[PDB]
């Protein structure tokens, strides 16, 4: 594991549509 | 006047590509996604796929990883769908829409596709 | 990945109507939910966004919920023209796609 790439589109939708 | 305006109806015989568009109008197209569903006639709503309009990032469904693509002209602030391998299930009215947390607030008229031999 | 809708909700004029979303923890239980509706003939038109918030110029008579792995919508003073097909729909984080639900078709009675 390392921090997800800016361009892991799938980690930055998957925080955009997250509801904590 | 946010406006998504969207391709005309199109006929395709199996096994070939469609390639609809829509311009983004209102707005700056950069500032919001894009998705992209489908509604076959007499079913309910699909979701296709989201496309980021300043890197042409996209993420497409399982049942079409394996048969669309998304585009993106940012000087005319333009998305294109391109399905291929086209089967008589591809026959729907295929809509754009302005991410909202999901699709949201703006949609497009849609595009009627018909698959047929 | 689907989440689960009513087939049909029937209910009278000038009362409160529910419509029931149910996903997993996935969907509606890591992600934000929204409400659509379609009359007919029309494109969906957006009713709720990110559990409860309204998009500008729909009526407070909607309402949305969340709770858990459930979703709710709620339309108060119903209408004959609130009668179309109430879609629900939330970002499944497992395979990463945005599911729709499959429709409740409401019908106002009397």
């Known amino acids: 594991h390392s921090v997800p790439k800016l361009s892991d589109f799938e980690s930055e939708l998957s925080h955009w549509f997250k509801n904590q | 006047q946010v406006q998504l305006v969207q391709s005309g109806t199109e006929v395709r015989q199996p096994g070939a590509s469609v390639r609809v568009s829509c311009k983004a109008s209102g707005y700056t197209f950069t500032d919001s996604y894009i998705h992209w569903v489908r509604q076959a006639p007499g079913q309910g709503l699909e979701w296709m796929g989201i496309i980021k309009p300043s890197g042409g990032n996209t993420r497409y469904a399982q049942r079409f990883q394996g048969r669309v693509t998304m585009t993106r002209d940012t000087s005319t602030s333009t998305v294109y769908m391109e399905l291929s391998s086209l089967r008589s299930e591809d026959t729907a009215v295929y809509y754009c829409a302005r991410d909202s947390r999901g699709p949201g607030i703006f949609w497009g008229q849609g595009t009627l596709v018909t698959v047929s031999s | 990945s689907v989440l689960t809708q009513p087939p049909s909700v029937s209910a009278a004029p000038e009362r409160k109507v529910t419509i029931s979303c149910s996903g997993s923890?996935?969907?509606?239980?890591?992600?934000?939910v929204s409400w659509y509706q379609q009359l007919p003939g029309t494109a969906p038109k957006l009713l709720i966004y990110?559990?409860?918030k309204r998009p500008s110029g729909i009526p407070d008579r909607f309402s949305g919920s969340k709770s858990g792995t459930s979703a709710t919508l709620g339309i108060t003073g119903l209408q004959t023209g609130d009668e179309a097909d109430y879609y629900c729909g939330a970002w499944d984080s497992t395979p990463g796609t945005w599911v729709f639900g499959g429709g409740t078709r409401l019908t106002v009675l009397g």
């Open positions: 990110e559990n409860n």
């Open positions: 923890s996935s969907n509606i239980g890591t992600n934000f």
